[PDB]
Amino acid sequence: FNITETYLRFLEEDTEMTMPIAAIEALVTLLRIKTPETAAEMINTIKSSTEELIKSIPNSVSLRAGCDIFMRFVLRNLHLYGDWENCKQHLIENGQLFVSRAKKSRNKIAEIGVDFIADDDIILVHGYSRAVFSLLNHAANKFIRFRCVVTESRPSKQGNQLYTLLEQKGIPVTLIVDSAVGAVIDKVDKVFVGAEGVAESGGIINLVGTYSVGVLAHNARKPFYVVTESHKFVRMFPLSSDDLPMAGPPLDFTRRTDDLEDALRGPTIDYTAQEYITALITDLGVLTPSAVSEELIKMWYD
Amino acid sequence: EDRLQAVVLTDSYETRFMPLTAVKPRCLLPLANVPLIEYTLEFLAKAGVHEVFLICSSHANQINDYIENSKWNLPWSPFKITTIMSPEARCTGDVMRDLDNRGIITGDFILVSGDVLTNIDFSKMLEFHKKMHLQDKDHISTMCLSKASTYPKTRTIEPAAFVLDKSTSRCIYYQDLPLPSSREKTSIQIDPELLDNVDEFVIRNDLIDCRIDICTSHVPLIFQENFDYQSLRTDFVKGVISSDILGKHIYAYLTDEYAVRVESWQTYDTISQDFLGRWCYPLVLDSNIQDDQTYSYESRHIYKEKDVVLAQSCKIGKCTAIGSGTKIGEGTK
């Protein structure tokens, strides 16, 4: 029936259906066909489909995290030894209810996380997450004064994409390069970030230059922010500064070339430690330091 | 010591404010986006008043309707407001005789002319009034005074010179002077009847008037007896001192903290700038007294209420206050 193909169908869609929430909705559809009455036939085939999904993954982390929460909810269903049928109907229904919860959470955060941006504050924003930009838009809806500084992130050129999406709103902007990002931290009140994942330790899984931002801000004593939707938690503990799950290059040094083809190769995803984050924002209240681990301990019961 | 009644002199300094007071009353006007009466009423509540009196005649209907809407018509209030309706525009002496004819004054009563905002605790004042009343029987009224801004060279409307005792703090003389605005008069003549009774004479012009009074039951009886007295400061105080009834005393109270009565436009402007600054430590916009107020303090003395709307790239200054539901455009200072 396929799950990778269902995820590939979301091309011109996105924005509303968040990348993990669309993968979770795809997991529920695959579950509801071949009877969730059996726990040997279904769960094993769900595990095989997640393994097939991980094997097809090039540079995504959040899809593995979202699977875990689904699994957890499924197991928790019939924890009351309830009827093998009303528990099943509640499990199938919690697929569309899971996607509907992404809207309700965004409604919560955009009213909570506008408080952090005070009267007339210049912001240097890095990365693009649907939660951080929704704060930025619904603060403009709240009629609050804020300036914006764009970071030239280099994955699939994200800075230019961010700049254009800020133009459509009506907020004054200018391009700042990630090389010169050190020379900006004096005319900037606060530094904001959108994460691809949040660590078990309390650190962050992010883009092509975020640790560098974290350290410079720690030097300048200027605050460093992480805002996300509460589903990007993996049981992952990157022990060192340069160790992450990869399908491509972990720093490759190429031979002598004349035509100039083999060059680009650098760490596209980088980790930053727990100390560098001043504040973290999700729908699960306002919490930062040891909070992430407590969430993971509560979920995994281990 | 408990049970205290207060009388407020409104309809008193009208047309002293020249372009205004045409349609709406004197005391309705806001200092910091809130009526002048509200400040006075807050001073009454902090003092400990159980019964409130107000004097309304000109634009009296608008005053009465404002009291109806006020936070004191509601049963939980420590004081109840009763309005005195008199003939249109009369002197303070005429109102004093009217109130004595009605006869509500019991023991020690309060009289305030104009609207005064002060941070000075009144509990100390009451005690020192009572301590001095126990000193001798024939003792009348209490007057408040505060230290001026070093030199009163900009203060021309209030040129009141006070002669005071170092030991008993009794007032001797009151005098008005045209001096800096109109260079015509220089001379001040003083009565030499009280020379060796006092000995420690202290003459000062460096004191601000307050016109806030703690008064005994003697006062309304004296006003009816001597109906020639129209004023309460210029002729009355001087008349009391200059052997009208022998052995009668009046108080003068010195206080280091801020207490300024509103009277003129340029005095009002200074008081307002003092309120925007942190001169009146308790009396600040952020505390919110009118209940509808939602002001919040920001650094560099900038006040903003809730629902403040402002355009981007706009500069705000020092000692500023902006109300609720307010919109501002670009390029504003």
Swiss-Prot record, chain A:
Q: Name one GO biological process term.
A: cytoplasmic translational initiation
* InterPro entries from the UniProt entry: eIF2B_alpha/beta/delta, elF-2B_alpha_N, IF-2B-related, IF_2B-like_C, NagB/RpiA_transferase-like
Q: Does this entry carry the keyword Transmembrane?
A: no
Q: List the keywords (alphabetical).
A: Acetylation, Activator, Cytoplasm, Initiation factor, Phosphoprotein, Protein biosynthesis, Repressor, Translation regulation
Oligomer status and interactors? Component of the translation initiation factor 2B (eIF2B) complex which is a heterodecamer of two sets of five different subunits: alpha, beta, gamma, delta and epsilon. Subunits alpha, beta and delta comprise a regulatory subcomplex and subunits epsilon and gamma comprise a catalytic subcomplex. Within the complex, the hexameric regulatory complex resides at the center, with the two heterodimeric catalytic subcomplexes bound on opposite sides.
Output the Pfam families linked to this UniProt entry: IF-2B
Entries under PANTHER family matching the protein: TRANSLATION INITIATION FACTOR EIF-2B SUBUNIT ALPHA
Where does it live in the cell?
Cytoplasm, Cytosol
One GO molecular-function entry: enzyme regulator activity
Where Phosphothreonine occurs along the chain? 288
**The keyword Acetylation is assigned to this record:** yes
Miscellaneous information on this protein: Present with 8970 molecules/cell in log phase SD medium.
- Superkingdom is Eukaryota
Q: What is this protein called?
A: Translation initiation factor eIF2B subunit alpha
Query: What does the similarity note say?
Result: Belongs to the eIF-2B alpha/beta/delta subunits family.
Question: What is the stated purpose of this protein?
Answer: Acts as a component of the translation initiation factor 2B (eIF2B) complex, which catalyzes the exchange of GDP for GTP on the eukaryotic initiation factor 2 (eIF2) complex gamma subunit. Its guanine nucleotide exchange factor activity is repressed when bound to eIF2 complex phosphorylated on the alpha subunit, thereby limiting the amount of methionyl-initiator methionine tRNA available to the ribosome and consequently global translation is repressed.
> Could you name the Gene Ontology cellular component terms for this entry?
cytosol; eukaryotic translation initiation factor 2B complex; guanyl-nucleotide exchange factor complex
Gene inactivation phenotype reads: Inhibits GCN4 derepression in glucose, amino acid, or purine-starved cells.
Q: What is its main location?
A: cytoplasm
From Swiss-Prot, chain B:
Q: Where in the cell?
A: Cytoplasm, Cytosol
Give the protein's biological function. Acts as a catalytic component of the translation initiation factor 2B (eIF2B) complex, which catalyzes the exchange of GDP for GTP on eukaryotic initiation factor 2 (eIF2) and is regulated by phosphorylated eIF2. Its guanine nucleotide exchange factor activity is repressed when bound to eIF2 complex phosphorylated on the alpha subunit, thereby limiting the amount of methionyl-initiator methionine tRNA available to the ribosome and consequently global translation is repressed.
The protein's assembly and partners: Component of the translation initiation factor 2B (eIF2B) complex which is a heterodecamer of two sets of five different subunits: alpha, beta, gamma, delta and epsilon. Subunits alpha, beta and delta comprise a regulatory subcomplex and subunits epsilon and gamma comprise a catalytic subcomplex. Within the complex, the hexameric regulatory complex resides at the center, with the two heterodimeric catalytic subcomplexes bound on opposite sides.
Other comment: Present with 33800 molecules/cell in log phase SD medium.
What is the similarity comment for this entry? Belongs to the eIF-2B gamma/epsilon subunits family.
Q: What's the name of the protein?
A: Translation initiation factor eIF2B subunit epsilon
- Gene that this polypeptide is encoded by: GCD6
